Write a protein that binds this ligand. Structure first.
Ligand SMILES: CCc1ccc(S(N)(=O)=O)cc1
Length: 126
């Protein structure tokens, strides 16, 4: 069902949360080789999560589930804010800018944390 597809998307989101926090620790410890590999893993995970979310929104649309479509539209916009900050973080890392990297890292945390309020409401609506 769309509901079980959302639970799979939720798990993939949780995987990125896990990899993010082991990356933040690696960044703080100065282990740039690790950070590079975690950033590649996160990019893949975010690409997969976006693809599961789009397929869930398209299916809720075909199903006429208006409340779910509203919530998923609001979520996909916030998800894009996260994506943009993530990509900026990656570029900060490429450029050797630890100041901006720290900034984007803290911002992505606040975007992702705020997002979970909606993420939890979508589960209950599908
Ligand atoms: C694209 C980054 C991202 C990943 C996950 C979320 S959330 N916590 O599911 O709203 C928000 C933003």
């Amino acid at each position: 069902s769309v509901k079980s597809e959302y639970a799979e998307a939720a798990a993939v989101g949780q995987e990125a949360v896990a990899v993010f926090n082991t990356m933040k620790a690696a960044f703080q410890n100065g282990d740039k080789e690790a950070v590079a590999q975690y950033l590649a893993r996160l990019a893949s995970l975010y690409t997969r999560h976006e693809e599961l979310l789009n397929r869930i929104l398209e299916k809720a649309r075909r199903e006429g589930n208006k409340e779910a479509v509203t919530l998923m539209n609001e979520f996909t916009a916030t998800f894009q804010t996260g994506k943009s900050i993530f990509n900026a973080m990656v570029a900060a890392f490429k450029n050797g800018d630890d100041d901006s990297f720290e900034s984007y890292l803290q911002a992505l945390e606040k975007v992702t944390a705020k997002g979970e309020t909606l993420a939890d409401q979508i589960a209950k609506a599908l």
